[PDB]
Design a protein around this ligand. Sequence first.
Ligand code: FMN
Ligand code: MN
Ligand code: MN
Length: 169
Amino acid sequence: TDISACSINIFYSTLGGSTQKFAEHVADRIRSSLQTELVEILNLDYIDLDEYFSKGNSNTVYLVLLPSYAIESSIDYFLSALQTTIDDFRIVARPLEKLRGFAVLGFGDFEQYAGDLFCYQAIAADQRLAKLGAQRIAPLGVVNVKLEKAQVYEAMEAWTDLFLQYAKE
Ligand SMILES: Cc1cc2nc3c(=O)[nH]c(=O)nc-3n(C[C@H](O)[C@H](O)[C@H](O)COP(=O)(O)O)c2cc1C
Ligand SMILES: [Mn+2]
Ligand SMILES: [Mn+2]
């Protein structure tokens, strides 16, 4: 089903508030690029995760904007809820097979967390959504939030545009 025809859910998590601001900006760029009012932003901390990640509609896209935290955070709970859904016998295999698809954008600090930790929770989200049967529309994007602010914005704008291009092919 056509991307312009789809309802678009933008999930995010935030401790410091930057990923919220970035999710508003990604939402506004998608709204203006597709001339659609079918874009919603959802804070993963305020949402019933089984309702969204245990079942999906053919006319729905999921975008996941996720910072990474090496400390324990609500994001740990998001990733565990995905793993529980993959593993629990009481839930069917590939419950998101009917989703139009999904893409992940991760935020991380390369200066401090270069290596296995850089955007590690966005990498895990991308792998687990694919194991839930959701078709990946675009490759995982990562933004180093220690670049200049102009470059952080240019990076998530290029990823939003690549996402819209892939979704139209
Ligand atoms: C305590 C702490 C731990 C962090 N751990 C990681 C990490 O493991 N990997 C990473 O890529 N970035 C890490 N970062 C950088 C954050 O992901 C980044 O600052 C992100 O923009 C936070 O978004 P928020 O403002 O929406 O919470 C960490 C930052 C802090 C303050
Ligand atoms: Mn529930
Ligand atoms: Mn429920």
